[PDB]
């Protein structure tokens, strides 16, 4: 996860992949400026540091 | 011995924001002012981090950086991850009256799966025996990917020495060709039956003889 | 905006001494940080030298200690950089480096530059093989032409085909590294083959350590 | 609607249909206990009162 609307209290997780509220605006559910996907993958390479 | 460590190849992803590291040992680097380079592949390098917090004039505002001293590490982050991000990135900073610049952090990544090698022999001719030399030049291109291995074959022996072989370099065609090149005298050439140069590939195999009669 | 040209390179020498010059304009010289900066070729940035904005202050990497040399003038607005002493190490492309108010706010200021390589053990006169594949059937790589550039030190050398004539199909292999640690070559034409008797080739091989410049006719066997 | 997380300002309506939390513990946004659909469906008849 990248976004989250505050901090997390200890010992506690969250399973819901809903899309991360970061302007005033509302993008009414879809993908587009001001709202994103706030779980986020990584990369992984054998001859990283 | 002051230095700056930071990774060579992250931010391989499309369209979201990821943060890339430098960290430095020595010393801690919130004392002195770190910069950030984006350099262009083959041009001129330029800047896109100074002072630490602010922008050059006409720079996107999609790149953003922040400071922690729990880690002693600084954190640059690029939000928009646009068409224009193929760079490599170095953290600069200062200790005493020198300048300490970071390794590099490559950024490039933001129809037929199999194709026949072409190889070609080119037999020495009458020119270049009369001056006591043969070169016999083993070719081969468009394969892939670029993993082969070339070897010579003689009437009832394999050759060891006089062989070299260059790696595979970059064409014009989304394809790769290498080159290999060998020595040999002319008593050998006309003492042998026939000549093969062969290349293996991913389970492919391609043989190819010639004769010494002209 | 801001202009700068840098024009010191474009020769090789063991351990001699080099000149490097860079030329800036459109603003003070005699007012901000100037310093010096090259990098390796494939390798990442490292520093090399700093001076002073009227050049009472100058100062280098250890490395470089001992050697190197630094000065400038505000009459006509220009750097100066000598060296001495040079190692292989030393193939790298020179930026000049501006500053603005110190060595805290940062390079931001990287020139085009000049490349820079060293190569030793002199030279020695190439070779030159333009063979001539009379017999040959279709369906190959090469139709039916060839040349040979070997036993030539160092790199590189300027390969041209009928005095630049033709440009279309011409593919060049890179050298290759032998036993001795010799370079050698071959660059290749698609030409039809109705051509051979009727179209003279001009196999043209160029070297700039050894100024020959040799000219060799085609002809099939 | 018989559910909200809170109470409605005044001239708001909302849209989005998601899972009902009432409890402590998530149900990872599948049907069983501890939570439901908030949304409802309703039933007429013509003889009632």
């Known amino acids: 996860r990248l976004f989250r609307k505050s901090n997390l209290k200890p010992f506690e997780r969250d399973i819901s992949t809903e899309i991360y509220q970061a302007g005033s605006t509302p993008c009414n559910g879809v993908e587009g400026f001001n709202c994103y996907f706030p779980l986020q993958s990584y990369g992984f390479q054998p001859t990283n540091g | 011995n002051f230095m700056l460590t930071q990774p060579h190849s992250v931010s391989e992803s499309p369209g979201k924001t990821v943060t890339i590291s430098c960290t430095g040992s020595?010393?801690?680097?919130?004392?002195?002012?770190v910069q950030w380079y984006q350099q262009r592949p083959g041009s001129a390098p330029t800047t896109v981090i100074y002072?630490?917090?602010?922008?050059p004039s006409g720079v996107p505002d999609r790149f953003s950086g922040s400071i922690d001293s729990s880690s002693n590490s600084a954190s640059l982050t690029i939000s928009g991850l646009k068409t224009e991000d193929e760079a490599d990135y170095y953290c600069?900073?200062?200790?005493?009256?020198?300048?300490?610049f970071g390794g590099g952090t490559q950024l490039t990544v933001l129809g037929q799966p199999k194709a026949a090698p072409s190889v070609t022999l080119f037999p020495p001719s009458s020119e270049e025996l009369q001056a006591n030399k043969a070169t016999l030049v083993c070719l081969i291109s468009d394969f892939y990917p670029g993993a082969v291995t070339v070897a010579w074959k003689a009437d009832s022996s394999p050759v060891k020495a006089g062989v070299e072989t260059t790696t595979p370099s970059k064409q014009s065609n989304n394809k790769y060709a290498a080159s290999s090149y060998l020595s040999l005298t002319p008593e050998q050439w006309k003492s042998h039956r026939s000549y093969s140069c062969q290349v293996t590939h991913e389970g492919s195999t391609v043989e190819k003889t010639v004769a010494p009669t002209e | 905006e801001v202009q700068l040209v840098e024009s010191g390179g474009g020769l090789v020498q063991p351990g001699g001494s080099l000149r490097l010059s860079c030329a800036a304009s459109?603003?003070?010289?005699?007012?901000?940080?100037m310093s010096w900066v090259r990098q390796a070729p494939g390798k990442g940035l490292e520093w090399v030298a700093n001076?002073?904005?009227?050049?009472?202050?100058?100062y280098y990497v250890d490395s470089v200690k001992g050697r190197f040399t630094i000065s400038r003038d505000n009459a006509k607005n220009s750097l100066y950089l000598q060296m001495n002493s040079l190692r292989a190490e030393d193939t790298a492309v020179y930026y000049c480096?501006?500053?603005?108010?110190?060595?805290?706010?940062?390079?931001?200021?990287w020139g085009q530059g000049t490349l820079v390589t060293v190569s030793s053990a002199s030279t020695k006169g190439p070779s030159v093989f333009p063979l001539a594949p009379s017999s040959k059937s279709t369906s190959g790589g090469t139709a039916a032409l060839g040349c040979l550039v070997k036993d030539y030190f160092p790199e590189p050398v300027t390969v041209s085909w009928n005095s630049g004539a033709l440009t279309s199909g011409v593919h060049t292999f890179p050298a290759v590294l032998q036993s001795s640690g010799l370079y050698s070559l071959s660059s290749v034409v698609t030409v039809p083959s109705s051509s051979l008797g009727t179209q003279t080739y001009i196999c043209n091989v160029n070297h700039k350590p050894s100024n020959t410049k040799v000219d060799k006719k085609v002809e099939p066997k | 609607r018989l559910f909200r997380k809170s109470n409605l300002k005044p001239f708001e309506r909302d849209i989005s249909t998601e899972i009902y939390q009432a409890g402590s513990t998530p149900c990872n946004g599948v049907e069983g206990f501890n939570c439901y659909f908030p949304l409802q469906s309703y039933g007429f008849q013509p003889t009632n009162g």
């Open positions: 002072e630490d917090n602010q922008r």
């Open positions: 600069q900073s200062y200790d005493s009256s020198n300048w300490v």
């Open positions: 001076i002073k904005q009227d050049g009472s202050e100058k």
């Open positions: 459109g603003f003070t010289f005699s007012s901000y940080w």
């Open positions: 020595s010393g801690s680097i919130a004392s002195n002012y």
């Open positions: 480096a501006r500053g603005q108010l110190g060595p805290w706010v940062g390079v931001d200021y």
